[PDB]
Each structure stands twice: as structure tokens, then as C-alpha cells.
Amino acid sequence: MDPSQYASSSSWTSFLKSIASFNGDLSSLSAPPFILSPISLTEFSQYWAEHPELFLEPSFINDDNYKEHCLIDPEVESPELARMLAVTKWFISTLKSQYCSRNESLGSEKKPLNPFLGELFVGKWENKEHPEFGETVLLSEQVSHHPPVTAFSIFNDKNKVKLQGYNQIKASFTKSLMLTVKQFGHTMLDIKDESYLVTPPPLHIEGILVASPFVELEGKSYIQSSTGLLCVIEFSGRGKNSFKARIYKDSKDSKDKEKALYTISGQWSGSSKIIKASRLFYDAARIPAEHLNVKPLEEQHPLESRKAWYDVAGAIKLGDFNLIAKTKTELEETQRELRKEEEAKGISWQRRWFKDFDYSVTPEEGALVPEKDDTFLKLASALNLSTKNAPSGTLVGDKEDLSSIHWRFQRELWDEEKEIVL
């Protein structure tokens, strides 16, 4: 079936009709095979660093070289601002990865595989052509299934750049059959001793009537630094993927747009320019994604995503209804059986590399809680960001601002990991 036959197929009409009775759980969407992705959501974590050089760039900016690492402003006022510029550029560079990859590789957004609890995805950017980079490692874990929650860490030891975060969504259909999505979660980025707090934006999926789904971003993302500096990024559709970002000396100033130290505008999936107090800031079309190195299937542990979903992926690619349904049930029995074995060997398969910390004022007696100087508390306080499980970017005293549970990477658990290698 050619894609121009999709919107009026029986399958698609049947799909749309069942939206009317949508039960609130996206995984139960009865999507036709042609709209299915063979990729699991635990793989989406790789999309935070597909431009390794931009990921690592802030670690190379110091007091003695900063004017030489600010292409759009050679008289940038400080290394702190030069690094905030660089973090903003990196963040803008992830968006195309995050939100357009299925478009390019599959032809539209397609329904992802709902990962099983304890599913794992790992790989590395080896950065062989730039020895000063060193290897950057991605760990990604399905820390919850009901609701689905993915947690991840991307880390470069050589340059002391690490990122961690987690992601969850809530979604509902509007009466025009547009799917509105709010993201939940945040990501933190340490560049040596300096820290950055990033909130993903709300989004909507369009082109559903026409059976050509695509993501458009809306609302705002924040990037708050331990330096006090704050970038606010506002998205809209257009003609697409446009935005306007502003960087402020601090979060009090962000209340007044004319206080912006710089202003960036354009398309995150194309080009954008910047003005101070214009030049090319980022051109997504000039800078190809670099895909992480994943180990061969034959060498994968059966918890690992591509190994786990192999037969399911093969059946989706064939578009075979029966075979998909059958491979899915065998996957479920394999994973149940796999967990039993983890358990017999004394292996914790559930909170494997990340733990759920309780930031509420009423933790349970033995619960994991934040230590005094916690990076998240200090950056959320700088931004006036709610520390509860509200939609990402929710500010203190917003309507949405309920638990305060956050996933945090524990490096030691990966250093003493019992099975999984890179």
C-alpha cells in the first residue's frame, strides 16, 4: 500500500473511529501495521547527543580561550555566556534528532514499540576522528512501564561532561483528532563543575486525518545554568519547526524580553540566526547526525532493546498482522522467563542504574531523598521551577503546581553492572 492510499483505507478509518473511545493509554492504540515503528522508545535517549562535537564543546571553553569559542560573538562578555551559547546550540541541535528522525527514516512519525520494564539500550559514540573527544557512552533504561518512563545518562569521562534525565508523557486527543502531548521530566548537564537544567517542551501531532503524522513543538523550554544565566526557548509552527530563544543574565530579567543579552530565531530543523543586545547560529541541514555505535545483535544481552524486539521488528517490516501479534506474545513470554532468571541470579532488573528519589516534603521513612546541595533543587530554585511531577517547565504557582518522584543515575551501579557491556 502506497502512503497516498493510507487516509482512505479501511484500516485508517477504523483507526480514527477507535480514537473516539481512546482509553488514555497510547500503547493500546490499534494502529494499522503501515503506521507502526520498529523502534522502541528506550532508543530515543540517543537523540540527546547525535552531534558529539556540540555535546562536548562547552567543556573546551575556559578563561584562557573563550573568545576563540564563540563563533557568533568574538567579544562575548565572559566564558560563562560563551558556554551558555554553546549549550543552547547543542540543545537546538538535538531537536531534529528528537522530533524528525522517523520522518526521514520511515516517512512519517509512526507508533513506537512500548518498551518492557527493565528494557535496556546502550551504545557509544567512539569519536574516532577526534582523539581529544574520547568515547561518550549512552545508558538508557525503561524504569517504569505503568506509566511508561525512560531514564538515561550520556557521559564523557575524558572531558567530564555528563548528562542524565528521564522522560514520561501524558496525551489526549482533541476533537479535531489532534494528539496533544505534555512531556514530564527534566535533564541535567554537568560540564566539569558547572551545571545546566533543561526542560523538554509540550508538543502536538498533526497530519493524523491524512495519515501522515508529524510532531510540531509549542510552549517553552528552559535552560537554567548554575552560573545564573537562563535561556528561554519558545516554539511555534509556521508556513515550520520555528523558535525564538532569548538568553538573560538571570531569571528575574526573563520577565522582560528587552533585557535579552541575545536573541535567536529561525527553524530548529533548518537555520536560525542570532542578534546581540545578525549572524548564522545553527544550520541543521549542514550538520549530519552521527549515530551511536551499538554492538552487533549476536553479541547483545537479551534485555537489550534491539535484541529483545528483533522478531517483532521483522514482522512490522513485513506488515504481517498475524505475525506481529504472534511475535509480541512470544516476546512477552521470553521477558517474563528472562526476569525469573535475573531474579534467580540475584540480579536487580528493576531499578538497575537509576533510582527514584523522593523530593516531596513527606518522604517515606526509608526513602531515597536529595542530599543538601542537590543540583536539581538549586537550579529549580534559580528558575522558580516547580519540583513536583508537573508537566516539564511548570513554574512554582502555576495551576499544575501531587508527587515529586525523580529518577537519578547512579554511576556505581553501572561500574558494578553484572551483565551488560558496551
Ligand X SMILES: C[C@@H](CI)CCC(=O)[C@@H](C)[C@H]1C(=O)C[C@H]2[C@@H]3CC=C4C[C@@H](O)CC[C@]4(C)[C@H]3CC[C@]12C
Provide the pairing of β-strand 36-40 with 111-113. parallel
Residue 46 annotated as lining a ligand binding site = no
Establish whether 336 is an annotated binding residue. yes
Is 409 a binding residue for ligand X by CB under 6 A? The answer is: no
113 assigned binding-site residue: yes
157 phi/psi in degrees, rounded to 5: -55, -40
Task: Spell out where 7-157 has E strands.
Answer: 36-40, 111-113, 120-125, 136-145, 148-156
Which positions from 166 to 205 touch ligand X by CB under 6 A, shown as an x/- string?
Answer: -x-x---------x-x-x---------------------x
33 annotated as belonging to a binding site for a ligand: no
Cα-based angle 261, 49, 395 (whole degrees, multiple of 5):
50
In the complex with ligand X, which residue's Cβ is closer, 29 or 377? 29
Nearest approach, Cβ of 177 to ligand X (angstroms)?
A: 8
Phi and psi at residue 385, to the nearest 5°: -85, 135
**110 near ligand X, rule: CB under 6 A:** yes
What's the Cα-to-Cα distance from 252 to each of 45, 80, 247, 257, 394, rounded to whole Å? 32, 18, 12, 11, 16
Instruction: Provide the total of helices (H) and of strands (E) in the chain, helices listed first.
Output: 8, 19
Is residue 145 marked as binding?
Answer: yes
Collapsed DSSP state (helix, strand, coil) of residue 112: strand
Q: List the grid coordinates of 363.
A: 518522604
220 is in an annotated binding site: no
Asked whether the CA dihedral 6, 308, 142, 116 is positive or negative, the reply is positive
Q: How far is the CB of 129 from ligand X (least distance, A)?
A: 27
According to CB under 6 A, which one of 32, 58, 79, 213 is a site residue for ligand X?
Answer: 213
Q: Which of 98, 142, 224, 327 binds ligand X (CB under 6 A)?
A: 98
- Pick from 6, 12, 26, 46 the residue near ligand X by CB under 6 A: 26
- Nearer Cβ to ligand X, position 97 or 267? 97
Say how far apart CA 301 and CA 294 lie, in whole Å. 12
- In whole angstroms, how close is the CB of 178 to ligand X at the nearest point? 8
CB of 215 to ligand X, least distance (A): 5
Residue 390 binds ligand X (CB under 6 A): no
Selection from 215, 213, 217 nearest residue 202 by Cα:
217
177 annotated among ligand-binding-site residues = no
C-alpha cell at 384: 522558580
Write the DSSP string, 81-109: HHHHHHHHHHHHHHHHHHHHHHHHHHSS-
Binding mask 31-70 for ligand X (x = CB under 6 A): ----x--------x--x-----------------------
In the chain, the N- to C-terminal Cα span, in Å, equals 39
Nearer to ligand X, 136 or 199 (CB): 199
Give the integer Cα–Cα distance in Å for 394 and 412: 31
Q: Which residues bind ligand X (CB under 6 A)?
A: 26, 29, 35, 44, 47, 98-99, 109-112, 167, 169, 179, 181, 183, 205, 208, 213, 215
Query: Binding site for ergosterol: which residues?
Result: 98
Query: Binding site: which residues?
Result: 26-31, 98, 102, 111-114, 145-146, 328, 332, 336
